[PDB]
Structure formats: structure tokens, C-alpha cells
Short mmCIF file of C-alpha atoms and ligand atoms in Angstrom, two decimals:
data_model
loop_
_atom_site.label_atom_id
_atom_site.label_comp_id
_atom_site.label_asym_id
_atom_site.label_seq_id
_atom_site.Cartn_x
_atom_site.Cartn_y
_atom_site.Cartn_z
CA UNK A 1 108.83 122.29 79.46
CA UNK A 2 107.50 123.52 82.76
CA UNK A 3 109.94 122.84 85.80
CA UNK A 4 109.03 121.93 89.19
CA UNK A 5 111.70 121.65 92.06
CA UNK A 6 111.12 119.20 94.40
CA UNK A 7 113.44 118.54 97.40
CA UNK A 8 113.47 115.82 99.98
CA UNK A 9 114.23 116.66 103.46
CA UNK A 10 113.97 114.61 106.51
CA UNK A 11 115.96 112.46 108.87
CA UNK A 12 118.62 110.03 107.85
CA UNK A 13 116.93 106.34 107.17
CA UNK A 14 113.26 107.89 106.62
CA UNK A 15 113.48 106.36 102.86
CA UNK A 16 114.11 109.64 100.80
CA UNK A 17 116.85 107.98 98.49
CA UNK A 18 114.34 104.95 98.02
CA UNK A 19 111.41 107.21 97.14
CA UNK A 20 113.84 109.04 94.89
CA UNK A 21 114.87 105.66 93.05
CA UNK A 22 111.53 104.41 93.01
CA UNK A 23 110.35 107.55 91.07
CA UNK A 24 113.30 107.68 88.74
CA UNK A 25 112.87 103.53 88.03
CA UNK A 26 108.93 104.00 87.25
CA UNK A 27 109.22 106.40 84.83
CA UNK A 28 111.28 106.62 81.81
CA UNK A 29 114.38 108.79 81.13
CA UNK A 30 120.32 117.03 84.67
CA UNK A 31 123.08 114.30 84.69
CA UNK A 32 125.68 116.69 85.41
CA UNK A 33 124.57 117.50 88.82
CA UNK A 34 125.18 114.53 90.28
CA UNK A 35 124.03 111.20 91.67
CA UNK A 36 121.43 112.97 94.11
CA UNK A 37 119.53 114.82 91.52
CA UNK A 38 116.65 112.85 89.49
CA UNK A 39 114.86 114.33 86.32
CA UNK A 40 111.38 112.64 84.85
CA UNK A 41 108.30 114.33 83.07
CA UNK A 42 104.82 113.24 84.05
CA UNK A 43 101.54 114.08 82.82
CA UNK A 44 99.31 115.68 85.36
CA UNK A 45 95.77 116.47 84.45
CA UNK A 46 96.42 116.28 80.64
CA UNK A 47 99.67 118.64 81.08
CA UNK A 48 103.34 117.55 81.19
CA UNK A 49 105.23 118.26 84.32
CA UNK A 50 109.00 117.89 84.51
CA UNK A 51 109.88 117.24 88.16
CA UNK A 52 113.57 117.95 89.21
CA UNK A 53 114.04 115.62 92.42
CA UNK A 54 116.68 116.57 94.68
CA UNK A 55 117.77 114.24 97.20
CA UNK A 56 121.13 115.66 98.74
CA UNK A 57 120.12 116.27 102.57
CA UNK A 58 122.57 114.05 103.96
CA UNK A 59 126.04 115.52 104.89
CA UNK A 60 128.25 119.14 97.76
CA UNK A 61 127.07 123.09 96.67
CA UNK A 62 123.48 122.06 96.45
CA UNK A 63 123.40 120.36 99.79
CA UNK A 64 124.40 123.37 101.61
CA UNK A 65 121.45 125.46 99.96
CA UNK A 66 118.64 122.82 99.95
CA UNK A 67 116.42 125.19 101.84
CA UNK A 68 116.70 127.70 98.93
CA UNK A 69 116.27 126.08 95.51
CA UNK A 70 112.88 123.94 95.95
CA UNK A 71 109.63 125.10 94.60
CA UNK A 72 108.03 122.48 97.14
CA UNK A 73 109.03 120.34 100.00
CA UNK A 74 108.59 116.87 100.91
CA UNK A 75 109.40 116.67 104.49
CA UNK A 76 109.44 112.77 105.01
CA UNK A 77 109.32 110.89 108.24
CA UNK A 78 108.86 107.14 108.85
CA UNK A 79 105.77 106.03 110.57
CA UNK A 80 107.82 103.42 112.50
CA UNK A 81 110.24 105.95 114.03
CA UNK A 82 108.94 108.99 116.52
CA UNK A 83 112.12 110.93 116.52
CA UNK A 84 111.97 111.33 112.72
CA UNK A 85 108.53 112.68 113.00
CA UNK A 86 109.66 115.25 115.77
CA UNK A 87 112.66 116.08 113.28
CA UNK A 88 110.06 116.81 110.68
CA UNK A 89 108.95 119.45 113.11
CA UNK A 90 112.58 120.73 113.53
CA UNK A 91 112.59 120.82 109.49
CA UNK A 92 109.19 122.72 109.31
CA UNK A 93 110.54 125.60 111.31
CA UNK A 94 113.83 125.68 109.49
CA UNK A 95 112.29 125.87 106.20
CA UNK A 96 109.34 128.53 106.92
CA UNK A 97 112.30 130.73 108.40
CA UNK A 98 114.34 130.41 105.29
CA UNK A 99 111.35 131.31 103.14
CA UNK A 100 109.39 133.44 105.07
CA UNK A 101 107.64 135.57 102.28
CA UNK A 102 106.38 132.60 100.30
CA UNK A 103 103.43 130.24 100.43
CA UNK A 104 105.70 127.10 99.74
CA UNK A 105 103.95 123.89 98.88
CA UNK A 106 105.04 121.43 101.53
CA UNK A 107 103.88 117.63 101.86
CA UNK A 108 104.36 115.83 105.16
CA UNK A 109 105.11 112.36 103.94
CA UNK A 110 104.61 109.71 106.42
CA UNK A 111 106.89 106.75 104.62
CA UNK A 112 107.19 103.13 105.57
CA UNK A 113 103.67 102.63 105.63
CA UNK A 114 103.92 98.81 104.82
CA UNK A 115 105.45 98.15 108.22
CA UNK A 116 102.05 97.94 110.08
CA UNK A 117 103.14 96.58 112.97
CA UNK A 118 106.14 98.84 113.96
CA UNK A 119 103.80 102.04 113.72
CA UNK A 120 105.11 104.49 116.11
CA UNK A 121 102.74 107.42 114.19
CA UNK A 122 99.45 107.22 113.88
CA UNK A 123 97.67 108.75 110.63
CA UNK A 124 95.74 110.74 113.00
CA UNK A 125 98.54 112.39 114.21
CA UNK A 126 100.41 112.84 111.05
CA UNK A 127 96.98 114.20 109.93
CA UNK A 128 96.55 116.43 112.75
CA UNK A 129 100.33 117.77 112.40
CA UNK A 130 99.40 118.90 108.61
CA UNK A 131 96.08 120.53 109.60
CA UNK A 132 97.45 122.58 112.46
CA UNK A 133 100.58 123.73 110.77
CA UNK A 134 99.21 124.31 107.36
CA UNK A 135 100.46 121.76 104.71
CA UNK A 136 99.24 118.39 103.20
CA UNK A 137 99.81 115.01 104.55
CA UNK A 138 100.14 111.47 102.78
CA UNK A 139 101.46 108.13 104.12
CA UNK A 140 103.51 106.21 101.16
CA UNK A 141 105.54 103.25 100.75
CA UNK A 142 108.62 103.05 98.87
CA UNK A 143 109.02 99.28 99.68
CA UNK A 144 105.44 98.36 98.10
CA UNK A 145 104.92 101.36 95.74
CA UNK A 146 102.04 102.95 98.12
CA UNK A 147 101.07 106.45 97.10
CA UNK A 148 104.38 107.01 95.00
CA UNK A 149 102.54 108.21 92.27
CA UNK A 150 100.05 109.99 93.97
CA UNK A 151 102.69 111.85 95.96
CA UNK A 152 104.33 113.51 92.90
CA UNK A 153 101.13 114.03 91.16
CA UNK A 154 99.84 115.82 94.42
CA UNK A 155 103.02 118.11 94.56
CA UNK A 156 102.50 119.19 91.08
CA UNK A 157 98.91 120.13 91.35
CA UNK A 158 100.14 121.89 94.80
CA UNK A 159 102.70 124.17 92.83
CA UNK A 160 100.41 124.94 89.88
CA UNK A 161 97.68 126.17 92.52
CA UNK A 162 100.42 128.70 93.85
CA UNK A 163 101.55 129.16 90.47
CA UNK A 164 98.55 129.60 88.11
CA UNK A 165 95.38 131.48 87.81
CA UNK A 166 92.20 130.16 89.49
CA UNK A 167 90.68 129.73 85.67
CA UNK A 168 93.57 127.46 84.78
CA UNK A 169 93.16 125.32 87.78
CA UNK A 170 89.48 125.39 87.60
CA UNK A 171 89.73 123.46 84.08
CA UNK A 172 92.67 121.07 85.67
CA UNK A 173 90.20 120.12 88.88
CA UNK A 174 87.01 119.61 86.20
CA UNK A 175 89.66 117.46 84.11
CA UNK A 176 90.73 115.32 87.20
CA UNK A 177 87.21 115.00 88.30
CA UNK A 178 85.81 114.06 84.69
CA UNK B 1 91.03 114.24 101.54
CA UNK B 2 94.49 114.16 99.59
CA UNK B 3 95.78 110.80 98.85
CA UNK B 4 94.04 109.42 102.21
CA UNK B 5 90.63 107.88 102.43
CA UNK B 6 89.86 106.60 106.42
CA UNK B 7 87.65 103.53 107.49
CA UNK B 8 87.43 102.99 111.38
CA UNK B 9 86.59 99.50 111.87
CA UNK B 10 85.81 98.01 115.33
CA UNK B 11 86.04 94.02 116.29
CA UNK B 12 83.60 93.09 118.93
CA UNK B 13 82.56 89.63 120.04
CA UNK B 14 83.15 87.38 123.09
CA UNK B 15 86.67 86.70 124.58
CA UNK B 16 88.52 83.89 123.16
CA UNK B 17 86.46 83.86 119.77
CA UNK B 18 90.03 85.19 117.81
CA UNK B 19 89.45 88.96 117.45
CA UNK B 20 93.09 89.73 118.31
CA UNK B 21 94.33 86.78 115.84
CA UNK B 22 92.39 88.44 113.04
CA UNK B 23 93.88 91.87 114.16
CA UNK B 24 97.58 90.19 114.02
CA UNK B 25 96.74 88.97 110.55
CA UNK B 26 96.05 92.13 109.65
CA UNK B 27 98.83 93.66 110.99
CA UNK B 28 101.17 91.55 109.09
CA UNK B 29 102.07 89.37 111.80
CA UNK B 30 98.27 96.48 119.77
CA UNK B 31 94.73 98.13 120.70
CA UNK B 32 95.14 99.63 117.07
CA UNK B 33 96.58 98.81 114.01
CA UNK B 34 96.74 101.11 110.67
CA UNK B 35 97.07 99.72 107.23
CA UNK B 36 96.19 100.95 103.33
CA UNK B 37 94.94 98.19 101.25
CA UNK B 38 93.62 98.23 97.94
CA UNK B 39 90.14 97.32 97.17
CA UNK B 40 88.23 97.55 93.67
CA UNK B 41 91.45 99.32 92.47
CA UNK B 42 91.14 102.16 95.07
CA UNK B 43 93.33 102.49 98.22
CA UNK B 44 91.53 102.21 101.53
CA UNK B 45 93.12 103.23 105.10
CA UNK B 46 91.25 100.98 107.88
CA UNK B 47 91.92 101.71 111.38
CA UNK B 48 91.27 98.54 113.17
CA UNK B 49 90.39 98.66 116.76
CA UNK B 50 90.62 95.62 119.01
CA UNK B 51 89.71 96.70 122.22
CA UNK B 52 86.28 95.32 123.30
CA UNK B 53 85.74 93.86 126.65
CA UNK B 54 82.72 92.35 128.01
CA UNK B 55 80.38 99.24 125.89
CA UNK B 56 78.37 102.06 124.57
CA UNK B 57 80.66 104.59 123.27
CA UNK B 58 82.44 101.35 121.67
CA UNK B 59 79.01 101.26 119.74
CA UNK B 60 79.48 104.70 118.40
CA UNK B 61 83.49 105.25 117.44
CA UNK B 62 83.14 102.85 114.15
CA UNK B 63 82.40 103.39 110.56
CA UNK B 64 81.90 99.63 110.43
CA UNK B 65 81.81 96.22 113.08
CA UNK B 66 83.20 92.79 112.85
CA UNK B 67 81.23 90.82 115.05
CA UNK B 68 83.12 87.74 115.86
CA UNK B 69 81.91 84.33 117.11
CA UNK B 70 83.29 81.03 117.11
CA UNK B 71 82.19 78.18 115.01
CA UNK B 72 83.02 75.83 118.04
CA UNK B 73 81.15 77.95 120.65
CA UNK B 74 77.37 78.19 120.48
CA UNK B 75 76.93 80.98 123.50
CA UNK B 76 79.33 83.00 121.69
CA UNK B 77 77.16 82.98 118.50
CA UNK B 78 74.34 83.95 120.49
CA UNK B 79 76.46 86.78 122.07
CA UNK B 80 77.34 88.02 118.43
CA UNK B 81 73.59 88.11 117.52
CA UNK B 82 73.01 90.19 120.62
CA UNK B 83 75.64 92.69 119.64
CA UNK B 84 74.34 92.91 116.35
CA UNK B 85 70.90 94.18 117.69
CA UNK B 86 72.71 96.56 120.34
CA UNK B 87 74.78 98.00 117.41
CA UNK B 88 71.60 98.89 115.27
CA UNK B 89 69.87 99.91 118.50
CA UNK B 90 72.99 102.38 119.03
CA UNK B 91 73.06 103.81 115.78
CA UNK B 92 69.28 104.48 114.79
CA UNK B 93 69.59 106.86 112.34
CA UNK B 94 72.22 105.08 110.16
CA UNK B 95 72.81 101.92 108.33
CA UNK B 96 76.14 100.73 110.09
CA UNK B 97 78.10 97.83 107.90
CA UNK B 98 78.55 94.96 109.85
CA UNK B 99 79.83 91.70 109.00
CA UNK B 100 78.99 88.82 111.27
CA UNK B 101 82.05 86.47 111.30
CA UNK B 102 82.14 82.67 111.95
CA UNK B 103 85.96 82.21 113.12
CA UNK B 104 88.08 78.85 113.76
CA UNK B 105 86.37 77.28 110.42
CA UNK B 106 89.53 74.85 110.53
CA UNK B 107 88.40 73.14 113.23
CA UNK B 108 85.82 70.92 111.44
CA UNK B 109 85.37 68.21 114.29
CA UNK B 110 84.74 70.65 117.28
CA UNK B 111 82.01 72.94 115.15
CA UNK B 112 78.68 73.61 116.94
CA UNK B 113 77.11 76.20 114.87
CA UNK B 114 76.58 75.27 111.13
CA UNK B 115 77.55 77.12 108.01
CA UNK B 116 73.98 77.17 107.16
CA UNK B 117 72.63 78.23 110.55
CA UNK B 118 75.37 81.43 110.31
CA UNK B 119 73.84 82.21 107.08
CA UNK B 120 70.22 81.73 107.97
CA UNK B 121 70.76 84.33 111.00
CA UNK B 122 72.87 86.72 108.94
CA UNK B 123 69.46 86.95 106.49
CA UNK B 124 67.30 87.22 109.40
CA UNK B 125 69.78 89.83 111.18
CA UNK B 126 69.94 91.73 107.84
CA UNK B 127 74.08 91.86 107.82
CA UNK B 128 76.64 90.38 105.87
CA UNK B 129 78.19 86.78 106.52
CA UNK B 130 81.74 85.23 106.21
CA UNK B 131 83.42 82.34 107.99
CA UNK B 132 87.07 82.68 108.66
CA UNK B 133 90.11 80.57 109.84
CA UNK B 134 92.69 83.11 111.56
CA UNK B 135 95.20 79.94 112.36
CA UNK B 136 95.25 78.73 108.93
CA UNK B 137 94.35 82.28 106.93
CA UNK B 138 91.24 81.79 105.08
CA UNK B 139 88.98 84.34 103.88
CA UNK B 140 90.60 87.04 105.94
CA UNK B 141 91.82 88.99 103.35
CA UNK B 142 88.13 88.93 101.86
CA UNK B 143 86.60 89.77 105.43
CA UNK B 144 88.62 93.41 105.36
CA UNK B 145 88.13 93.92 101.54
CA UNK B 146 84.30 93.06 102.24
CA UNK B 147 84.18 95.53 105.37
CA UNK B 148 85.48 98.32 103.16
CA UNK B 149 83.09 97.51 99.99
CA UNK B 150 80.14 97.97 102.71
CA UNK B 151 81.18 101.39 104.23
CA UNK B 152 81.47 102.60 100.42
CA UNK B 153 77.87 101.44 99.82
CA UNK B 154 76.70 103.96 102.34
CA UNK B 155 79.47 106.62 101.96
CA UNK B 156 80.04 106.90 98.35
CA UNK B 157 77.70 108.18 95.18
CA UNK B 158 75.74 105.33 93.22
CA UNK B 159 77.94 105.63 89.98
CA UNK B 160 81.16 105.61 91.94
CA UNK B 161 80.15 101.97 93.69
CA UNK B 162 78.69 100.88 90.00
CA UNK B 163 82.23 101.12 88.73
CA UNK B 164 83.66 99.48 91.46
CA UNK B 165 81.40 96.38 91.17
CA UNK B 166 82.08 96.48 87.62
CA UNK B 167 86.13 96.33 88.21
CA UNK B 168 84.96 93.86 90.99
CA UNK B 169 83.21 91.16 88.80
CA UNK B 170 85.71 91.72 85.93
CA UNK B 171 88.54 90.29 88.65
CA UNK B 172 86.62 87.61 89.81
CA UNK B 173 85.17 86.67 86.44
N1 GDP C 201 110.03 98.73 104.71
C1 GDP C 201 110.34 99.99 104.18
N2 GDP C 201 111.50 100.15 103.82
C2 GDP C 201 112.02 101.17 103.45
C3 GDP C 201 111.02 102.08 102.79
N3 GDP C 201 111.87 103.19 102.46
C4 GDP C 201 112.94 102.72 102.65
N4 GDP C 201 113.28 101.99 103.09
C5 GDP C 201 114.27 101.14 103.82
O1 GDP C 201 114.86 102.15 104.73
C6 GDP C 201 116.32 102.35 104.82
C7 GDP C 201 116.71 103.67 104.44
O2 GDP C 201 116.18 103.95 103.51
P1 GDP C 201 116.94 105.27 102.65
O3 GDP C 201 116.31 105.60 101.02
O4 GDP C 201 118.52 105.13 102.53
O5 GDP C 201 117.14 106.49 103.81
P2 GDP C 201 117.25 108.00 103.78
O6 GDP C 201 118.46 108.10 104.56
O7 GDP C 201 116.08 108.98 104.03
O8 GDP C 201 117.61 108.76 102.21
C8 GDP C 201 116.73 101.27 103.45
O9 GDP C 201 116.95 99.92 103.99
C9 GDP C 201 115.27 101.15 102.82
O10 GDP C 201 115.38 99.99 101.93
C10 GDP C 201 109.53 101.73 102.92
O11 GDP C 201 108.75 102.52 102.20
N5 GDP C 201 109.11 100.76 103.70
N1 GDP C 202 92.00 76.68 115.47
C1 GDP C 202 91.93 78.01 115.27
N2 GDP C 202 92.03 78.88 116.19
C2 GDP C 202 92.35 80.15 116.69
C3 GDP C 202 91.36 80.95 115.33
N3 GDP C 202 91.50 82.24 115.81
C4 GDP C 202 91.88 82.40 117.12
N4 GDP C 202 92.30 80.88 117.49
C5 GDP C 202 92.90 80.73 118.82
O1 GDP C 202 91.97 80.98 119.82
C6 GDP C 202 92.64 81.71 120.88
C7 GDP C 202 91.78 83.05 121.20
O2 GDP C 202 92.27 83.91 120.51
P1 GDP C 202 92.11 85.67 120.59
O3 GDP C 202 92.58 86.19 119.53
O4 GDP C 202 93.05 85.92 121.89
O5 GDP C 202 90.80 85.88 120.94
P2 GDP C 202 89.96 87.19 121.52
O6 GDP C 202 89.87 87.22 122.96
O7 GDP C 202 88.83 87.56 120.83
O8 GDP C 202 90.95 88.49 121.15
C8 GDP C 202 94.09 81.96 120.77
O9 GDP C 202 94.51 80.74 121.49
C9 GDP C 202 93.98 81.33 119.40
O10 GDP C 202 95.31 80.77 118.76
C10 GDP C 202 91.33 80.18 114.19
O11 GDP C 202 90.98 80.82 113.30
N5 GDP C 202 91.25 78.83 114.13
MG1 MG C 203 119.29 109.00 101.49
MG1 MG C 204 91.99 89.77 122.29
#
């Protein structure tokens, strides 16, 4: 068993809990930690990955220490809410301040991709933020299950790139391509 | 890129043909809409531009073009035909995906341009052809799926496109 501690942060209402629950619902199977922690094991590039998913950003002990426990952070905004996109920047700064020495894997997540007509953040703008500030970008929908699978496979791959040798990840990339 | 593949699709054609009404269906219902859809089992993020005014730069921005006329208006059919050539001329080093779109197919008693004529001209023009009704939603889904396939044919390896055609043939049959 290899653990991947993944933390959801972002403005209230962007879909963190809905993403978490969709992830938990799709995959079969740390209950003592409480109702905001989800554990599921995935197969990624022919190797098991046990994701511990932490969703306690909203205003008990784990909540006050959210920035310190993760191997990887999902900074979520809603594509329909400019304010949440700005909040994601506040969070990026707060997080890289708390973990100054570490190349912490971050995914910027533009959630609610199904709400096409209410879009306030262009995919180009989300992409540009990720490029300039050095993280990965993906648009998702918990409502429609767009890229939910891809998000969690992606975060595993990103953590593995930081942890493991160029050889190991070389075989895994060759596994993924073929 | 990571979990995202982008397709810039531009709607062009005469005023009143139904460019915006098609864009509205795409949106779910303002210059631009952005939606990810699945085609042949693979997600495709379409950036749909609906800002054509009746120039040269608009001919350069797109990965692909939807040239729309109304089946009730012969003048719009001729302009669409003109735009097709202009676009080919504007992008000389490239084979740009184009669909010629005969919109308003619900208005049977008002039609001026026949289905055969549209098909025939499209063969002559070497482009794809489809008739749509934006009012009643017919072939609109097929239109946006079709433009994605078109871009993939130019962009991706011939093995990848072989897999997609097989996937597609199984779904339809
Ligand atoms: N349309 C749509 N609604 C969503 C999506 N994700 C979450 N929601 C809705 O957004 C609201 C807030 O979601 P929630 O998970 O509680 O947000 P949180 O505060 O970040 O944990 C709820 O009504 C959800 O049903 C999505 O991808 N699309
Ligand atoms: N009957 C019918 N009317 C349509 C169709 N598409 C558009 N229209 C109508 O044609 C008018 C012009 O459409 P619009 O989208 O504004 O054309 P545009 O100038 O090319 O963007 C509107 O009043 C629509 O209701 C269609 O498929 N069938
Ligand atoms: Mg929540
Ligand atoms: Mg219009």
C-alpha cells in the first residue's frame, strides 16, 4: 500500500465536497478520521494507489492544519465564479508560503465545466495561470463526471514524478502510452 | 496537454442564417462559448467563436470553420460558397477543416436551396456537408461531433484515427 494524501482547498461552493463524494461513490470501499475524509485505492499505470482525500477546508484538528498534511493539493474554483478564481490565487500563495522548500504537486481545478452558459473564467485564463505560476490545470464537472477520473489519476502521476526515480516513471510513461 | 485538448471553431456566414442560434444550442441555452464533449470516446474542448461580421484575421484564428447558410436563402448559400474559397486562399499551407452548414431544414415550404445542390456544391468545394435545424434541434449534435473528427484527421496520427473510426463504426453499427 502506497499512500497519496490529497487535500481539497478553495472557496465555499465551488464543488469540493461534491467532487470528493463522486470520487468516493464511484470507487468501491480511515473512517475514524470523520465524515470529511475519504480513502479509495485506484489502479494507475499498472500499480495500486491509495488516495486519502481530505475535504475539511470549511470552518476540527485537521482543519486547522490543512496546509501541512497533504502530499498534493487540489485548488478548486468554479468556472462560473470569478471571485473563486481569485480566491485560488490567495490559496496558491498561502500554500507555497507554508511549504516553501517542497516542490508540492498542485492542480488548479476549474470545476462546474457543465455550466457552459454561466462561464466567467475562460479555459485560456485558467491555463495561463497554471503555466505562469507553475502547476497543472484541468477543467472538471462533478455534476457530469467530466475528468473526475482523470483528475485523480493525474495527481497520482504527479506525486510519483516527485517521489520516484526517472527510471520508474520512464516505465510508467511507457506503460501509459502503450 | 494534461487532461485537456482544445479546438478553436469559428462560425461564419451571412447575417440571419442562424449562427448565434446554433451557438446557443452548443451553450445549452456571448461572443464565445467553451464546452468539453466526448467524441469517439475521447473528450474534446471546443472554443466556439460567434463574432463574424459582414474579416481577414477571423480567417486565421480558427482550427476549423462552420460556414452557415439558410436553406431558405439562396444569396446566403452563394456567400457561404464565396467564404469557403476565401478561407482556402487565406490558409494556403494548411488543409483547414470546414463544414458547410445548411441551416433551417425545418422550414420545408420556404426552401430555395435543395439538399442535392448543397451536397453537390460541397463535393465541388471539397468540404463536408450537413443540414441542421437549430429551432427544432436536428443534426446539431452531429455537426459539433463532425468538426472535432475533422480536426483530428489533420492533427493526429493515422493509428489514433483508425481506432476512432473503429469505435465510431461500432456505435453507429
Ligand atoms: N452544475 C454543477 N454543480 C456543482 C458541481 N459541483 C458541485 N456542484 C453544486 O455546487 C454546490 C456547492 O457544492 P459543494 O460540494 O457543497 O461545494 P464546496 O463548498 O466547495 O464543498 C452544490 O449545490 C453542488 O450540487 C458541478 O460540477 N456542476
Ligand atoms: N425555423 C428556423 N429558424 C431559425 C433556425 N436557426 C435560426 N433561426 C431564426 O433565424 C433568426 C436569425 O438567427 P441568428 O442566430 O440571430 O442568425 P445569425 O445572424 O447568423 O447569428 C432568429 O430569429 C432565429 O429564430 C432554424 O434552424 N430554423
Ligand atoms: Mg464542502
Ligand atoms: Mg448572430
